């Protein structure tokens, strides 16, 4: 269950499709926890395409429901990303994830 809470500005029409490589200034946040990931710290804003199961299931649906310039607020459920296993040392089992996502892309 991907729950979108968009901070408004953008265009609201430039929607992601297949065969489109896009750019996200994401920032990881643990619910009842601290940060764990930030593309803003590395200044290399994570160029990636859509559909090839690169990213987790929660980030995949939330990015497709956005448009250019928008700023959403993800709440990824445990069963779509890591809640069975958990990424070793970084993500505990049965964890619910928070993301600051801004789509500043091409295509």
């Amino acid at each position: 269950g991907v729950e979108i809470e968009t901070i408004s500005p953008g265009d609201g029409r430039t929607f992601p499709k297949k065969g489109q490589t896009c750019v996200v200034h994401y920032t990881g946040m643990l619910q009842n926890g601290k940060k764990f990931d930030s593309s803003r710290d590395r200044n290399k804003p994570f160029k990636f395409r859509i559909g090839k199961q690169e990213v987790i299931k929660g980030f995949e649906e939330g990015a497709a429901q956005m448009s250019l310039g928008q700023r959403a607020k993800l709440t990824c459920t445990p069963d779509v990303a890591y809640g069975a296993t958990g990424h070793p040392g970084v993500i505990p089992p049965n964890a619910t994830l928070i993301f600051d996502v801004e789509l500043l892309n091409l295509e």
Side-chain angles (χ1 to χ4, degrees), residues 15-106:
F15 289 165
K17 291 182 180 180
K18 289 183 180 179
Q20 294 183 358
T21 301
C22 58
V23 172
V24 171
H25 294 279
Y26 68 96
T27 297
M29 181 64 74
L30 182 64
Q31 180 178 1
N32 299 118
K34 65 182 291 294
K35 288 174 68 176
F36 63 94
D37 197 359
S38 176
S39 65
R40 300 292 295 162
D41 292 334
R42 292 188 296 272
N43 298 115
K44 185 177 184 292
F46 186 68
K47 295 182 181 180
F48 74 105
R49 65 183 294 164
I50 299 299
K52 299 296 184 290
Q53 292 182 356
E54 295 175 352
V55 300
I56 59 171
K57 293 181 180 180
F59 185 77
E60 185 178 3
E61 292 181 354
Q65 292 178 355
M66 290 178 69
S67 178
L68 175 58
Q70 293 183 354
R71 183 175 178 178
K73 183 178 184 292
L74 292 175
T75 303
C76 293
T77 62
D79 56 355
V80 300
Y82 291 100
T85 299
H87 185 73
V90 183
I91 303 301
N94 196 3
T96 304
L97 281 314
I98 305 300
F99 292 101
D100 191 4
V101 174
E102 182 177 1
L103 181 63
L104 297 176
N105 58 355
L106 296 176

